[PDB]
Amino acid sequence: GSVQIVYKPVDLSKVTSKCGSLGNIHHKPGGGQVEVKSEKLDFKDRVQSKIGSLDNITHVPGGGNKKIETHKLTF
Amino acid sequence: GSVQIVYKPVDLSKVTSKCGSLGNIHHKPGGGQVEVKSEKLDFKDRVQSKIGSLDNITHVPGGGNKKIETHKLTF
Amino acid sequence: GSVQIVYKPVDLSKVTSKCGSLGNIHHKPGGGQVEVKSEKLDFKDRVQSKIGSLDNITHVPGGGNKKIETHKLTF
Amino acid sequence: GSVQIVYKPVDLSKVTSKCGSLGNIHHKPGGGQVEVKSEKLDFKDRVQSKIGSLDNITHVPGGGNKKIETHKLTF
Amino acid sequence: GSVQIVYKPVDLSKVTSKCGSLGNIHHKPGGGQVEVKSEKLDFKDRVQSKIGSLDNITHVPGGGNKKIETHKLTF
Amino acid sequence: GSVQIVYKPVDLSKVTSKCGSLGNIHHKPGGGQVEVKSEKLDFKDRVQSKIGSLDNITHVPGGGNKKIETHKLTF
């Protein structure tokens, strides 16, 4: 007799991530007037402060993709 | 007898990441007036401060892609 | 007898990253008036400060791509 | 005696027209397949024909604006 | 005696027309498959014919604006 | 006696027309396959024909603006 192998896996797959803000409509978003008045404050600690009328932040640590293929043929 | 191996794995796949802000419409976004008044304040460790009417920050630590193919044929 | 190997793996795949701000429309974005008034402040460690009407920041530590192929044929 | 006329009409008004398609998202609009098969047809006056999968026609004969001010001061 | 006129009409008004398609989202609108088969038709008249899977027409003859001011002062 | 006129009419108004397609996003619009087969057709007057998968037409006969001011002072 005789032996024949025809090995043809076909991969058409799509691994897709769509993260954050995609295709949105922001028509006239309005941040109102902001006022901050501070006096006599005492800090023994770290300070991180942020002040603002309109913060349109998009933050993406995620959306990463991992694809692994192992192909083994042994005769 | 005889042996024949025909080996043609085909990869047409797409690994895609779309992270942050894509295809959005920001029509007349308006950050209103900001005022900050501060006096006599006392700080004894590190200070960070950030003041502003309109921030459009897009931050992407993510969206990274990893593709591995291992192919082994052994006779 | 005889032995034959016909090894033709095909990779046409695409690894793609689209990170940050892509294809968006920012029509007349308006950062309003900012005022910051400070007096008698005392700091005993490091200070980092940022002031402004419109901050259209894009920051991308990510979006990196890693592709590994190993091919081994052995007889 | 004496006569004093102080005449200061103020117009800050807006006359505005917004006509057709404004500020929309059309996300993957898909016209499907079109097939037209015609034979032996006989025409004895004017013919107009229009064939197509996706038409995004905006037609605006309108949206015109007319402003009249007449000012008369007579002593 | 004496005579004084202080004529100060103030117009802050808006005349606004918004006609057609404004601020909509059309997510994946899909026009199905169209097939038209015709034979042996006879026309003694004008023909106007239109064939299509997705017709996203916006038509605006209207939305026009007319503002008239007459100001008359007589002494 | 005496006579005084202080004539200072102010126009800061706006006449605006926004006609056709403005500020829209068409993300991946897809015109499908079009096929037209014709034979043995007979025409004895004028023919006007148009064939196409994607027609993104904007037509504006309108949107014209007409501003008339007449000022008359007479003594």
From Swiss-Prot, chains A, B, C, D, E, F:
Glycans are attached at K44, K50, K66. There is a cross-link at K8, K14, K18, K28, K40, K44, K50, K66, K72 (Glycyl lysine isopeptide (Lys-Gly) (interchain with G-Cter in ubiquitin)). Changing S2N: In FTD1; minimal parkinsonism; very early age of onset. Expressed in neurons. Isoform PNS-tau is expressed in the peripheral nervous system while the others are expressed in the central nervous system. The modification Phosphoserine is found at S2, S21, S49, S53. This is Microtubule-associated protein tau. The lineage of its organism: Eukaryota, Metazoa, Chordata, Craniata, Vertebrata. Changing V34M: In FTD1; ultrastructural and biochemical characteristics indistinguishable from Alzheimer disease; accelerates aggregation of tau into filaments. Tau/MAP repeats lie at residues 3-33, 34-65. Promotes microtubule assembly and stability, and might be involved in the establishment and maintenance of neuronal polarity. The C-terminus binds axonal microtubules while the N-terminus binds neural plasma membrane components, suggesting that tau functions as a linker protein between both. Axonal polarity is predetermined by TAU/MAPT localization (in the neuronal cell) in the domain of the cell body defined by the centrosome. The short isoforms allow plasticity of the cytoskeleton whereas the longer isoforms may preferentially play a role in its stabilization. The record marks K8, K14, K18, K28, K37, K40, K67, K72 as: Not glycated. It is linked to In Alzheimer disease, the neuronal cytoskeleton in the brain is progressively disrupted and replaced by tangles of paired helical filaments (PHF) and straight filaments, mainly composed of hyperphosphorylated forms of TAU (PHF-TAU or AD P-TAU). O-GlcNAcylation is greatly reduced in Alzheimer disease brain cerebral cortex leading to an increase in TAU/MAPT phosphorylations. Frontotemporal dementia 1: A form of dementia characterized by pathologic finding of frontotemporal lobar degeneration, presenile dementia with behavioral changes, deterioration of cognitive capacities and loss of memory. In some cases, parkinsonian symptoms are prominent. Neuropathological changes include frontotemporal atrophy often associated with atrophy of the basal ganglia, substantia nigra, amygdala. In most cases, protein tau deposits are found in glial cells and/or neurons. The tau/MAP repeat binds to tubulin. Type I isoforms contain 3 repeats while type II isoforms contain 4 repeats. The modification Omega-N-methylarginine is found at R46. The modification N6,N6-dimethyllysine is found at K8. The modification N6-acetyllysine is found at K8, K14, K18, K28, K40, K44, K66. Interacts with MARK1, MARK2, MARK3 and MARK4. Interacts with PSMC2 through SQSTM1. Interacts with SQSTM1 when polyubiquitinated. Interacts with FKBP4. Binds to CSNK1D. Interacts with SGK1. Interacts with PIN1. Interacts with LRRK2. Interacts with LRP1, leading to endocytosis; this interaction is reduced in the presence of LRPAP1/RAP. It is found in: Cytoplasm, Cytosol; Cell membrane; Cytoplasm, Cytoskeleton; Cell projection, Axon. Phosphorylation at serine and threonine residues in S-P or T-P motifs by proline-directed protein kinases (PDPK1, CDK1, CDK5, GSK3, MAPK) (only 2-3 sites per protein in interphase, seven-fold increase in mitosis, and in the form associated with paired helical filaments (PHF-tau)), and at serine residues in K-X-G-S motifs by MAP/microtubule affinity-regulating kinase (MARK1, MARK2, MARK3 or MARK4), causing detachment from microtubules, and their disassembly. Phosphorylation decreases with age. Changing S49L: In fatal respiratory hypoventilation; unusual apparent autosomal recessive inheritance; reduced binding to microtubules as well as increased fibrillization and aggregation.
